[PDB]
């Protein structure tokens, strides 16, 4: 779930901000720190949903 979220969110960020025609090779991510996909939040939300 965290990896999928990373993949989708990073693709959306690149497409939204015109990054492709701005450099930013796809060999390095955006969501490293200060924006990391909260694993705890995803797990807890999923648990609550399944509750």
């Amino acid at each position: 779930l965290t990896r999928n979220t990373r993949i989708i969110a990073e693709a959306l960020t690149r497409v939204i901000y015109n990054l492709t025609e701005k450099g930013t090779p796809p060999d390095m991510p955006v969501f490293t720190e200060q924006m990391q996909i909260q694993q705890e939040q995803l797990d807890s939300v999923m648990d609550w949903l399944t509750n």
């Binding site: 901000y17 015109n18 701005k22 930013t24 090779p25 490293t32 909260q38």
Partner: protein, 186 residues
């Protein structure tokens, strides 16, 4: 010879910019504080060595990241041009969150707290859960600051049996999803 812009396109200003060389050229490299447009004027154009544009350790406190940390550029018999790097500022807030695990009927009779560690008798936030199993304490600053998340319910022990959870989340990170589980008895 490029630009230092933000994510959206805002040209960053006052960012220290330098190029650290490698190989024998590790000793060569200068810095230049970028202008409003983000147009740095790095000089010392010696061919035969690749360059690494990257963020000065000092003078760049307010700025958190530079997504293309370094850009490998081959220095041949000419100058470089069109060097665009995007950078991130340093968000300082904590943006607390966190769901609560309890039955539906107990939710209106609950208020999560933010008891500071140093004083557990003077709450600083008393977000009531109300009808939502999710508290979203307004963003705090992240510097130590041990806290408590004592779940202060209105339900007395006279008609039910319960234990109010308590969570400490010393604020040094960037988010939180406290997952208090509240299952009273009797």
């Amino acid at each position: 010879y490029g630009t230092v812009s933000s994510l959206n396109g805002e040209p960053e200003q006052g960012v220290a910019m330098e190029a650290v060389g490698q190989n024998d050229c590790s000793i060569y490299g200068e810095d230049t504080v970028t202008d409003e447009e983000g147009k740095f004027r790095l000089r010392g154009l010696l061919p035969g060595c690749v360059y690494h544009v990257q963020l000065k350790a000092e003078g760049n406190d307010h700025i958190e990241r530079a997504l293309p940390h370094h850009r490998v550029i081959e220095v041949g018999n000419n100058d470089i041009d069109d060097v665009n790097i995007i950078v991130f500022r340093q968000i300082n807030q904590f943006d607390l969150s966190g769901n609560v695990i309890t039955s539906s009927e107990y939710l209106p009779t609950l208020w999560v707290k933010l008891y500071k560690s140093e004083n557990l008798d003077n709450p600083i936030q008393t977000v009531s859960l109300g009808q939502s199993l999710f508290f979203h304490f307004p963003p705090l600053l992240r510097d130590g600051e041990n806290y408590v998340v004592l779940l202060d319910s209105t339900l007395p022990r006279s008609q039910y049996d319960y234990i109010l959870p308590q969570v400490s989340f010393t604020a040094v990170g960037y988010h939180k999803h406290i997952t208090l589980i509240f299952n009273p008895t009797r």
